[PDB]
Amino acid sequence: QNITEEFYQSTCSAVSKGYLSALRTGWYTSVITIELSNIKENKCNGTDAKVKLIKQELDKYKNAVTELQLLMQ
Amino acid sequence: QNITEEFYQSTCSAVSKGYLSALRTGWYTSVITIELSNIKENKCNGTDAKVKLIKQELDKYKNAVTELQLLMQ
Amino acid sequence: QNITEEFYQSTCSAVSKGYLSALRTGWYTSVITIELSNIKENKCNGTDAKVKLIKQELDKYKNAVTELQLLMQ
Amino acid sequence: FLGFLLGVGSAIASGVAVCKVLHLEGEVNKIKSALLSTNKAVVSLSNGVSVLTFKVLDLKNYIDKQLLPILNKQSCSISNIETVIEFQQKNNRLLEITREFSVNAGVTTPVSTYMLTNSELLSLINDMPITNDQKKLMSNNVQIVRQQSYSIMCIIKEEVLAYVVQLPLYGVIDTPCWKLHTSPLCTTNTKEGSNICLTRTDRGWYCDNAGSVSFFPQAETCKVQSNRVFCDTMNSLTLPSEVNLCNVDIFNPKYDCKIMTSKTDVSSSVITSLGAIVSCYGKTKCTASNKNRGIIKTFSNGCDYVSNKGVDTVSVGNTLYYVNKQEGKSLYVKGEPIINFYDPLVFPSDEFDASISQVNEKINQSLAFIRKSDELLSAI
Amino acid sequence: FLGFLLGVGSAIASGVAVCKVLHLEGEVNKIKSALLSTNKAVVSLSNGVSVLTFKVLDLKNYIDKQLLPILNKQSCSISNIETVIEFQQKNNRLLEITREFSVNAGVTTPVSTYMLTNSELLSLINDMPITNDQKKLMSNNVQIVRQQSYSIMCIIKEEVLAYVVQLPLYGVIDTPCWKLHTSPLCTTNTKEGSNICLTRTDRGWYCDNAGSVSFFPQAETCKVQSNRVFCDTMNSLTLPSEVNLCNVDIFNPKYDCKIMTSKTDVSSSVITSLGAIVSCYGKTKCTASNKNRGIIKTFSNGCDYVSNKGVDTVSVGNTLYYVNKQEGKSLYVKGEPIINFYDPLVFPSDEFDASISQVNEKINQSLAFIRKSDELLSAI
Amino acid sequence: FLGFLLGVGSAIASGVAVCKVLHLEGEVNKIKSALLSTNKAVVSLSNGVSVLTFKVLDLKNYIDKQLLPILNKQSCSISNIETVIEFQQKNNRLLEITREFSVNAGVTTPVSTYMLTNSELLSLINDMPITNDQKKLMSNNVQIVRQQSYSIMCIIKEEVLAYVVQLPLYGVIDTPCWKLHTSPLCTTNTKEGSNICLTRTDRGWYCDNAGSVSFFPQAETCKVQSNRVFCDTMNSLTLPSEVNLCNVDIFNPKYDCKIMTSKTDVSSSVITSLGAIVSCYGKTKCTASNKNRGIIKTFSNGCDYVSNKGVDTVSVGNTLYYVNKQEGKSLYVKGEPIINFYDPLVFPSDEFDASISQVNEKINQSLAFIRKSDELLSAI
Structure with missing residues (x-):
């Protein structure tokens, strides 16, 4: 890198040179998909462990789908 | 929906018609309350499981109350 | 607190007095450091519990270091 | 262009007004006492204001059923089932509300799902004293409603955490709207610097409102749903119906159309x-x-x-x-581009807040004091 | 209105200056060596700058007590107690710091609790070389301090992660402040377009500062705590004390009051x-x-x-x-509204950056060249 | 200063154009069918547009291997190992994507790691039809790429969640850039109010682009990497190469340099x-x-x-x-400061959008109609 500067007493201005461009000229569109599963409201009376953590995450999953559906079109 | 547009060569302007209003004219204020519990600094020497997860969440609860109290008035 | 106000009919202006200053005049810089550990990609075939939660957090740790390294200089 | 002509309001003045009342000695008690078993109660405060109070999260009654039976007696002892989970999900909401108020210094916008859930938001809309058309508009566009909403942190008097949620009131619905897009109109003649420009400053959103037209100078303040335009009246000017005549006829005698002149x-x-x-x-x-x-x-x-x-x-x-x-x-x-009708020799080249008649008046003043002074020297 | 008259600084120039020094070959070592057992050390860098270094989170020494004893010997084996939790809470801070620096490209504002905790923030305030009045001001308004703070990511040289926290220095405290609110003043006469307007451009926050007055043109840059005004000097102009005289007397000979004229x-x-x-x-x-x-x-x-x-x-x-x-x-x-004192026939109708005397000078120039030219033609 | 001269585009017009096509009856099916086993497929839509489709997270096939074998038969039963964890980390991404789209009403910027991971982002860059120099530029500055990116939520047709990620295309790279910094230039003479000012409005970023110069009036729109300037062409003007001549010679005949005059x-x-x-x-x-x-x-x-x-x-x-x-x-x-060359008696004191020759023309018009009128009265 070689950044240089010049001040002009006559016009009260300064020019900072030695920079390189990276201008956004256009766009690149890509469809990003997430495969979701429609699940029935079935239940189990279990459990000592693990499934109780899995049902909470499954209820959080349903809440996420509900909010995304609420976003309309 | 029936969105239409007209360009005016004489004035270098365009008018996009066929839109419907939804202007915020006023406000609706509602008090939202969360009932909190003041807890004493008591301890237990347990445990194999569960209570160690509950104490961490109780310490996170105290930290949340501390930050909210720090917000002054 | 003693906030007072005066309206001027002649100039269509108002002055709100009785306020106290707290202007940022300068800065205070301080280096904040977090000691990180470089870890080898070693493995274990365990476990029933606990270590499986610790490896997930260790993989999240590596991902955090990767993103911070990606930030360049 | 004309955003400088707008007034200046106080977005959270209504919300803070409710917060200031809640700071009183017996005001906190009235709120807590009314929400004894019910989670929704219209509490009338000491000053006389009627506000709908909501009990969204009960951490005290939840702690009282997992601290008092637990702690006892000699030392803390173990917990069963998925019940503890219930605490992790309840406490998470409080932590998120705290994080939001901490970074935003007590005033948050948009209103998050942690601050007010979809179920709680849709309940308030149904309990609001508004028309059925407004209720369906809000219910189908919750994300926009949240974006146009504010959440102000008021008090942390003990045993309760209170915060005012300022929700939008859509008094104007289904009225016709139109967006005006303007660009500079300059002469095309070849010599550089000899060219004169004209631009309509009146660009932005226009909506028919109560016999008048609500003009939004900063089109960014409005949100388009592909058919419905979500605007805020705070960022608007009340103009007469005759403003639309400028599009069909810029030289109309009913309304004086706003323009900007330059050489750029x-x-x-x-x-x-x-x-x-x-x-x-x-x-x-x-x-x-x-x-x-x-x-x-x-x-x-x-x-x-x-x-x-x-x-x-x-x-x-x-x-x-x-x-x-x-x-x-x-x-x-x-x-025919109007700019061609004006003589560049006598044209106001530096006007920022002018009109179609103000320019004509400036030309008439110039043209007269040019010809009268010409005839004065002609008698030499 | 007058925000265009402001200068242009570099908000993070002080923070980046410290980052640039830390990039040196032996500078990282000096930081790590000084924080051997102590979590707070004032490390003097090679150039000569004195900076307070803080060791907020020790993940290396924590990993060294749960990787080296664990891994051994043949294969990884199981963990007991709530000790693992300690890792989840420690790693969470790092993940949040990373998420913040990722989305904000190394520079974050406001400074979050994950970036610097309340306990760590209040410790820095007490160790800062400032007055007791300033320390109490910062301690009671931490959220505002965080809002006026910056966090710049500098280096990830191995075995340490360093980032500079740029904290505000409140050199001016308890001095009287006042907010000026201005609105357009136009003539009321009935015919449309014949009316002339006048508006004081000098609106904003004004604070008494070192024999002068600090003027904040964009009132949005200032934060009000209902008594205390939190401003940034970067977004201010240094005006003489005589500026307040404009409120009591707009035609004062001491200070030339700033106005804007229009027909809108x-x-x-x-x-x-x-x-x-x-x-x-x-x-x-x-x-x-x-x-x-x-x-x-x-x-x-x-x-x-x-x-x-x-x-x-x-x-x-x-x-x-x-x-x-x-x-x-x-x-x-x-x-009496001043606008009534001016003759609409001879009035500068398009001024954006004018004053009360500049308008008088423009009228005097017009009035003289109107009467002298009238007497010239009167001798025909 | 000259930001008002800029045009007005639609940042997400390209992204929404892809969303609008995906809303069609058989368009969703084509996307889902092509991604049968492969996670990357270039699906050609009904209208004719070629878009690279990515399957980032498979929750359906994961649920189908932990719901169908589990549920069976009489009632739900227990889970073994760390496999459940896999669900917590997979679902967390969806929850974060949802939280982001909820608060930002379907359009997010910058693009988070949850929306598109570093591994997925670097894969797209390598598959993009661009030069090797552009690929290395994006790979080394991912955080800037993310900051200049948009994520638009399109459809939630069942069994799939689709959203368009609008990525920047850097068509101009390694061309010389320069930043112009300007400040007001006033006369120093002692009496207050008698002083005249001059300021170059043309400040901002300047970059050499296809025989012309891309001018960025709002220097805030550009991002500096200490050597590389990241700009957006949307916030630029296409000026001739001769614009740089203003720095070495303000009175040059090739380009008419832009100035602003005041008394402030x-x-x-x-x-x-x-x-x-x-x-x-x-x-x-x-x-x-x-x-x-x-x-x-x-x-x-x-x-x-x-x-x-x-x-x-x-x-x-x-x-x-x-x-x-x-x-x-x-x-x-x-x-010598130019302002000294101008006579304050005949100087345009209120110009916002003027040039070095426009001021000369305004002086020439004044100077001539002052001397000619002086000689007119001299013959009395």
């Missing part, structure tokens, strides 16, 4: 709802192209327009503009 | 600290009302004012403004 | 890349100081400059400015 003949483009306005001046390469087949139209010097039908992109100099692909019908209204 | 007689409202300024012009419906009893005052054409005492809302056209309910004392200073 | 002789500072421009006027205390030794230079009235070499701070009135410590070479080009 710089090329640019205004991407409209159903196309693109192209202001081509000087040695600029202005073009309209279809992505599949390349360049379809090369713009000549002056102000032109292209419809979104068949045109995907518009290029003005080194700037590429993607045209909006919203389905609609466009119409090119042919007419 | 558009209705609007300026919500003040203790009331509302109402600029009513044309066919607009300007009103002041109490929510409990409806309309209490109907404004006539011109510029008027209403106190926050008894007035909850102000309506100007289709715009409803909620008045600030802050408790205070208002005073209506009666006086 | 207010003191301020412009912090440059390698120093500071100081505009000192009136009774202001303007100074340059080294932190270690205090005050090193006291500025006299007028416009001066100091290099970043040895100068840490610059003070203008009550405002302290930290100078950028970027290593470089500065040069003071000595020259």
Whole structure:
């Protein structure tokens, strides 16, 4: 890198040179998909462990789908 | 929906018609309350499981109350 | 607190007095450091519990270091 | 352009007014006492204001059923089932509310799902004293409602955490709206610096409101749902109905149309709802192209327009503009550019807040004091 | 209005200056070596700068006590107690710091609790070389301090992660402050377009600072705590004490008061600290009302004012403004609107950056070259 | 200053165009069918557009291997190992994507790691039809790429969630760039109000682009990486190469340099890349100081400059400015301040959008109609 500067007493201005461009000229569109599963409201009376953590995450999953559906079109 | 547009060569302007209003004219204020519990600094020497997860969440609860109290008035 | 106000009919202006200053005049810089550990990609075939939660957090740790390294200089 | 003409309000003045009342000695008690078993209670405060109070999260009654039976007696002992989980999900909401109020210094916008859930939000809309048309508008556009909402942290008097949620009131619905897009109109004659420009400053959103027209100078303040325009009256001006006459006739005697004059003949483009306005001046390469087949139209010097039908992109100099692909019908209204009617020798070249008649008055004053002074020296 | 007159600084120039020094070959070592056992060390860098270094999170020494004893020997084996939790809470801070630096490209504002905790923040304030009055100001307004703070990511040289936290220095405290609210002042005469306007551009925050007055043109840059005004000197101008004389006397010989002239007689409202300024012009419906009893005052054409005492809302056209309910004392200073003193026939109608004397000079130049030219033709 | 001269585009017009096509009856099916086993497929839509489709997260196939075998048969039963964890980490991404789209009403910027991971982002860059120089530029500056990116939520047709990620295309790379810093230039003569000012409005970023120069009026729109300038062409003007001649010669016949004239002789500072421009006027205390030794230079009235070499701070009135410590070479080009060449008696004191020749033309018009009218009365 070689950044240089010049001040002009006559016009009260300064020019900072030695920079390189990276201008956004256009766009690149890509469809990003997430495969979701429609699940029935079935239940189990279990459990000592693990499934109780899995049902909470499954209820959080349903809440996420509900909010995304609420976003309309 | 029936969105239409007209360009005016004489004035270098365009008018996009066929839109419907939804202007915020006023406000609706509602008090939202969360009932909190003041807890004493008591301890237990347990445990194999569960209570160690509950104490961490109780310490996170105290930290949340501390930050909210720090917000002054 | 003693906030007072005066309206001027002649100039269509108002002055709100009785306020106290707290202007940022300068800065205070301080280096904040977090000691990180470089870890080898070693493995274990365990476990029933606990270590499986610790490896997930260790993989999240590596991902955090990767993103911070990606930030360049 | 005309955003400087707007007034200046206080967005959270209504919310803070409720917070200031809640700070009183016996005001906190009235709130807590009314919400004994019920989670929704319309509490009338000491000053006389009627506010709908909501008990969203009960951490005290939850702690009282997992601290008092637990702690006992000699030492803390173990917990069973998924019940503890219930604490992790309940406490998470409080932590998120705290994080939000901490970074935003007590005032948050938009209102998050942690601050007010969809179930709690839709309940408030149904309990609001508003029309059925307004209720369905809010219910179908919750994310916009949340974006136009504020959450103000008021008190942390013990045993309760209170915060006011300022929700929008849509008094104007289904009335016709229109967006005005304007671009500079300059003379095309060849010598550089000899050219004069004209631009309509009156661009922005326009909506029919109570016999008048609500004008939004900063089109960014409005949100488009592809049919419905979500605006805020705070960022508007109340103009007479005759303002729309400027589009069909700029020299109309009913309304004095607002213009801006300059000599800066710089090329640019205004991407409209159903196309693109192209202001081509000087040695600029202005073009309209279809992505599949390349360049379809090369713009000549002056102000032109292209419809979104068949045109995907518009290029003005080194700037590429993607045209909006919203389905609609466009119409090119042919007419002589007004700038040609003005004499460049006697033209106000530096006007920022002028009108079509103010310029005429400035020309009339110039033209008269030029001819009268010419006849004065002619008698030498 | 006058925000364009401001200079242009580099907010993070001080923070980046420290980052640039830390990039040196032996600079990282000096930091790590000094923080051997202590979590706070004032490390003097190679260039000569004295910086307070803080070791907030020790993940290396924590991993060295759960990787080296664990891994051994043949294969990884199981963990006991709540000790693992300690890793989840420690790693969470790092993940949040990373997420923040990722989205904000190394520079974050406000400074979060994950970036610097309340305990760590209050420790720095106590160790800062500042007055006890400044320490109590920062300690009671941590959220504002965080909002006016920056966090710059510098290096990830191995075995340490370093980032500079740029904290505000409040050199000016407890000095008197005042906010100036201005609205357009136009003539009321009936024919449309014949009216002339005048507006004081000098609106914003004003604070007494070192024999001078610090002027903040963009009132948004300042934060009000209901008594204390939190401002940034970067967004200010240093004006002489005589600037306040403009409020009591606009035609004062000591200071040349700044004004803006137009013909745009558009209705609007300026919500003040203790009331509302109402600029009513044309066919607009300007009103002041109490929510409990409806309309209490109907404004006539011109510029008027209403106190926050008894007035909850102000309506100007289709715009409803909620008045600030802050408790205070208002005073209506009666006086003839200046705009009446100027002759509309000879008045500069298009001035954006003018003053009370610049307009007089423009009138004097016009009035003289009108009368002298009139007497010239009178001798025909 | 010249940001008002810019055009107006539609940032997400390209992304929404893809969303609108995906809403069709058989368009969703084509996407889902092509991604049968492969996670990357270039699906050609019904209209004819070629888009690269990505399957980032498979929750359906994961649920189908933990719901169908589990549920069976009589009732739900227990889960083994760390497999459940896999669900917590997979579902967390969906929850974060949802939270982001909820608060930002379907359109997010910057693009988060949850929306598109570093591994997925770097894969798209390698599959993009672009040069190897562009690929390395994006790969080394992912955080900037993310900041200049958009994520638009399109459809939630069942069994799939689709959203368009709008990524930047850097068509211009490694071309020379330069930043112009301007400050007001006023006369220094003692009587207050008698002084005239001049300011170059043409400040901002300038980059060489296809035989022309891309001008960025709002320097905030550009991002500096200490060597590379990341800009957006949407916020630019296409100016001829001759624009740079204004720096070496303001009165050049090739390009008409843009200026702003006033009488407001207010003191301020412009912090440059390698120093500071100081505009000192009136009774202001303007100074340059080294932190270690205090005050090193006291500025006299007028416009001066100091290099970043040895100068840490610059003070203008009550405002302290930290100078950028970027290593470089500065040069003071000595020259008579132009403002001295103009006669204050005949000078346009209120110009916002003027040029060096427009002022000369305004003076020539004044000077001629002053002398000719003087000779007219001289023959009395």
